[PDB]
Design a protein around this ligand. Structure first.
Ligand SMILES: NC(=O)c1ccc[n+]([C@@H]2O[C@H](COP(=O)([O-])OP(=O)(O)OC[C@H]3O[C@@H](n4cnc5c(N)ncnc54)[C@H](OP(=O)(O)O)[C@@H]3O)[C@@H](O)[C@H]2O)c1
Ligand code: SF4
Lengths: 147, 54
């Protein structure tokens, strides 16, 4: 009744505590994604530990432009993730092409390939604005399993 | 006198010939031809696409 309701929040507290990102070296957004590891604006053991390998991680951050050559590649990586998974599409390329969009190769918005939970709009995604991409992620995890 | 026709019977094969099996070939004079053929042993890798840390 009360113990059951608090135990579900305790499991959700583990995702609120720590989430491991994926080092998607996809574009210029990946350089600012490296700035999350940079000391001045840090999530290093604040709630983020870089390790790579899609099998171990909990959150994958799509960091830039995706093309038709990359659409089969990213899709199965998301499938290689453990079932409690979150996708953060960071940048205008990740939201529907920086420019592009009306281009031949670029797939529009990532959502055509892989579903996204948290959007970051910033081209040069400022590390200040990037910090929401992990903090809002933890805030969005509220309730899991009622019955 | 003995000729080449009698010498061909004593050639490298099976001495007495016949038998159920005659798949064996005379040995090469200075060991076998290189079995350079078969098995490329080329290992293919998909190292790139996304996140190789490199
Ligand atoms: N075996 C078969 O494949 C077969 C054969 C012949 C006919 N059919 C028909 O085809 C349909 C197949 O559907 P399905 O069985 O694949 O659906 P399902 O997997 O049972 O999914 C139904 C979803 O609706 C929610 N839901 C249903 N009743 C609920 C309730 N009383 N309270 C709260 N949430 C509820 C569930 O959410 P939660 O999980 O969060 O509760 C669940 O995610 C059936 O309706 C059946 O009539 C199926
Ligand atoms: S959104 Fe801007 S910074 Fe990010 S990959 Fe596209 S062009 Fe580069």
């Amino acid at each position: 009744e009360y113990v059951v309701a608090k135990l579900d929040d305790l499991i959700n507290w583990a995702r609120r505590s720590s989430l491991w990102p994926m080092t998607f070296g996809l574009a210029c957004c990946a350089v600012e994604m490296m700035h999350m590891a940079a000391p001045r604006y840090d999530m290093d053991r604040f709630g983020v530990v870089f390790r790579a390998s899609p099998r171990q991680s909990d959150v994958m951050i799509v960091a830039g432009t995706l093309t038709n050559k990359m659409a089969p590649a990213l899709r199965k990586v998301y499938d290689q993730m453990p079932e409690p998974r979150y996708v953060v599409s960071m940048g205008s390329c990740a939201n529907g092409g920086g420019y592009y969009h009306y281009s031949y190769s670029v797939v529009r918005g990532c959502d055509r390939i892989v579903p996204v939970d948290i959007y970051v709009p910033g081209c040069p995604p400022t590390a200040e604005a990037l910090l929401y991409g992990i903090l809002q992620l933890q805030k969005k995890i509220k309730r899991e399993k009622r019955l | 006198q003995p000729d080449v026709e009698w010498a061909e019977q004593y050639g490298g094969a099976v001495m007495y010939p016949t038998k159920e099996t005659a798949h064996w070939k005379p040995p090469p004079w200075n060991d076998v031809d290189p079995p350079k053929d078969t098995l490329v042993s080329n290992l293919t890798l998909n190292f790139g696409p996304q996140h190789p840390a490199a």
